[PDB]
């Protein structure tokens, strides 16, 4: 009956926020960092924005940049290997979900060595010790990996993404700095932006929802719906709004759950390596329609903060307005409307529906999802 | 760039103290010193926690010497008990007074150079985190469980001083209306308007930004909605108040308050006035004073406080916001004038000077002069 909230003890918000990291490291007396990132962020000079400030304050660092989209067991093991031979006593996550989730796995397994197979971390990880201290710097807007107690690792052998949930993995400090995010191509702003929206909407209507998370989620929907078109077009101010809104969504959904969008999205990541945000975006409006009659008054709120005039609308009419508002936003930021558009195969749907039913996220969905329900949703989402 | 310090872990709702035994075992702590006051031992509130700790086999000693507006003496005495207790962590059970006493003890224990206590004033230059604190509020009230601030009374200099330190943040908060139900109506009323003050002052403070604005406006809405119900003794309203007071804490701790708290602290020092009653009497008068320096923010306050602001000009809505606060104060049975609770006309000059010097006053959106604070005390005083 009582509800738990895990949050960052310390976080810095706004352009220039990464400038606070050298001070926070010195006040905690940490000796050497392993920075967990990917190739693109080294090559575009984003990592250098941090390693330059660390050089100027005389703080030692090694780099692991082997992280691929939808990080694998292989990538976790390889990164853990580098951390142990680096002599580091803390971690700095620089990137979107992929590096930040890779970083959490490494930080957990280092101080809980019985999980070295990594796949045994799935579900409520029964870890005894806190993670290696993590300092988190997101470069997408965003997975909110910096504030959530969750991370998603791809099992190549079993061809599935598995969710690990553990209060021990919470970063010590987050640095939410739109300066780190500006380099996102439009399509990445669009995808990660609707991933943030999905978190906010799924979180708002999830079974575990209560007053505090409702307050956070509805605020994040308002910020994201307001700013995402601006940000994809390349507006400085909208990009900062998105940086905050994606985080506020994290503060909610981490603590209560999401639903069938994330459940149906994870198999698409496993099977095709589909960007998490694109899969969520295509699925979100179809799953909202499916969930509609099981969400009380909450679609009125979604539609209103998304710019629709809901006064004088009936409950069912407002529920349609909320779904149409999400279709419209997807059209406007250039996310295709059908799963076949991103190479999902008609024949896989049975195996996809089964993976979706078994995914941790699906138990939070407000309408109780059957195998045949998920099959029909994939089909409706696949073509017209 | 703006910083947010929050609880890493907190539990919300009736029964939330049921999670403590689990949280202590997962952190491997051996023995607690519970910091509380006599009333909370006598009303069986402390026993609700020590019973659950007995059943899980977790050791505890108790310090119950905390008085309202905790003193340097009380901090020193409590620190003495903690060192001779063999405890390795702290459990705060009470409102601001025990929770603030507990933070001082936890800080000074691991930063022994502050044993005089009064050297903690301002941004405490502490090197080491506090002794781990687990916080259980029994008032709907100070948000001591989530803020990086604590207020200690200096008897010798006759002033309350604010200590601000990220090292004092509790590890876990337990926000449990079950622990709060035993508040007499007048205590629910006072601590409830202290929460409102935090929310309103925090909303309009100089350091305010989007995230704290979002928290504060939600807390104003919850408190304005629930406080009448809670004081009358409604179970559900008491839980709403328990959440709303906390959400206010998540904001103001990180950005600041203003001239209400600045003017309230001297009234605590001079007369031992309950913090919530002083804030309540002052709040509407300081809002009127601040009105012309708060942009559009009083529209928002008035709207979430149940006023229809759509047809209203800016100045008309600013008045509606102030009248909404007067009405709520009247309704929960708070005396409406400072003279009613024994504030003396002759002290106002010394009161105004203490207010000008208080840390809280630098956050106020309108820059306050000595003469301004003098005039505010006078207008707040009249029978
Ligand atoms: N600022 C940036 N500028 C340009 N490219 C960037 C930037 N930040 C990241 N990228 C690139 O975007 C691509 C996607 O990066 P991810 O980290 O995979 O993206 P994100 O959506 O943040 O994370 C998805 C991952 O997180 C999990 O929640 C989810 O299930 C999935 O595993 C990569 O090529 C990465 O290098
Ligand atoms: N649940 C309760 N049931 C009964 N009595 C209670 C309860 N909670 C508190 N009390 C009693 O109410 C009185 C006031 O307690 P405080 O802790 O002083 O109340 P609060 O308003 O929470 O604390 C204010 C303090 O915090 C600082 O911010 C402020 O400067 C001031 O020192 C005391 O006698 C205390 O025992
Ligand atoms: C169960 O809640 C979660 C579901 C999915 C994720 C990964 C993500 N960012 O989408 C994290 C979670 O938090 C515990
Ligand atoms: C300067 O900020 C503060 C002003 C007042 C207090 C005490 C209170 N809660 O009434 C705490 C503060 O810091 C968190
Ligand atoms: Fe996601
Ligand atoms: Fe206060």
Author numbering:
A (entry chain BBB): 2 to 385
B (entry chain AAA): 3 to 385
Quote the study on this structure.
The mode of binding of NADH in the active site, including the nicotinamide moiety, is well defined by the electron density map, being the same in both structures. Also, crystal structures were obtained of the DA1472 variant in the presence of the bulky substrate analog, compound 7, cocrystallized in the presence of either NAD+ or NADH. The mode of binding of the substrate analog is the same in both structures and well defined by the electron density map. The observed mode of binding of compound 7 is possible because of the N151G and L259V amino acid changes of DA1472. In particular, the side chain of Asn151 of the wild-type active site clashes with the mode of binding of compound 7.
Here it is shown which structural adaptations were introduced by directed evolution experiments that changed the catalytic properties of the Escherichia coli (E. coli) (S)-lactaldehyde reductase [EC 1.1.1.77]. This enzyme, referred to as FucO, is also known as an Fe2+, NAD+-dependent group-III alcohol de­hydrogenase and is involved in the catabolism of rare sugars in E. coli.
